[PDB]
Design a protein around this ligand. Structure first.
Ligand SMILES: Cn1cnc(N)c2ncnc1-2
Ligand SMILES: [Zn+2]
Length: 188
């Protein structure tokens, strides 16, 4: 049905739980946003589900994505992470997360909260993309492009326009659920 079309054809409970409980559901917590963004930066070259199934390994490797702690991680911490089981052993991907955490802190120093900074890009309100078929879906737009460029200036890495657009969908700043998907969030 509509769920199968919306949820990338998966019958895997982990992916289906993510589709229903996380993907496209507006997320307002600053640290939870950082975490989702950081996981997204790890995707390129792998499947998304592959990253999802490494989430717990990442949480342990990165102090549950607590930005103050992640930002303090050293070259030596990254050396250790190169053989930490079940995270992606791609040094620059891992270093990227440390740089992201640093950028997060810079943003919060300027604007008070990472959440507020992000949500400003959709004027504080989820953008219902109003899709009806999976074939309607785009992979990048002007807003994701601008956010990507702006993040880069703060030191964020591995977060190009396409990757930032996927994160917008996942964090529910964009709702990319199909109209008849049973998990489509309600909008005011
Ligand atoms: C459902 N999905 C597919 N691909 C990605 N890169 C994703 N990121 C968050 N959610 C995603
Ligand atoms: Zn859906």
């Amino acid at each position: 049905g509509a769920m199968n079309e919306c949820a990338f054809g998966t019958k895997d409970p982990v992916y289906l739980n993510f589709h229903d409980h996380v993907w496209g559901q507006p997320l307002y917590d600053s640290k939870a946003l950082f975490k989702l963004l950081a996981l997204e930066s790890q995707h390129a070259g792998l499947s998304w589900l592959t990253i999802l199934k490494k989430k717990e390994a990442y949480e342990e490797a990165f102090y549950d994505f607590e930005p103050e702690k992640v930002a303090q991680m050293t070259a030596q911490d990254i050396d250790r992470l190169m053989t930490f089981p079940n995270i992606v052993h791609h040094r620059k991907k891992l270093e990227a997360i440390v740089n992201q955490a640093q950028g997060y802190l810079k943003i919060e120093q300027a604007y008070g909260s990472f959440s507020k900074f992000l949500w400003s890009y959709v004027n504080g309100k989820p953008k219902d993309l109003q899709y009806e078929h999976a074939s309607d879906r785009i992979t990048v737009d002007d807003t994701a492009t601008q956010l990507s460029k702006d993040l880069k200036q703060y030191g964020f890495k591995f977060l190009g326009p396409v990757t930032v657009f996927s994160f917008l969908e996942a964090a529910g700043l964009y709702d990319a659920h199909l109209k008849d998907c049973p998990s489509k969030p309600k909008h005011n």
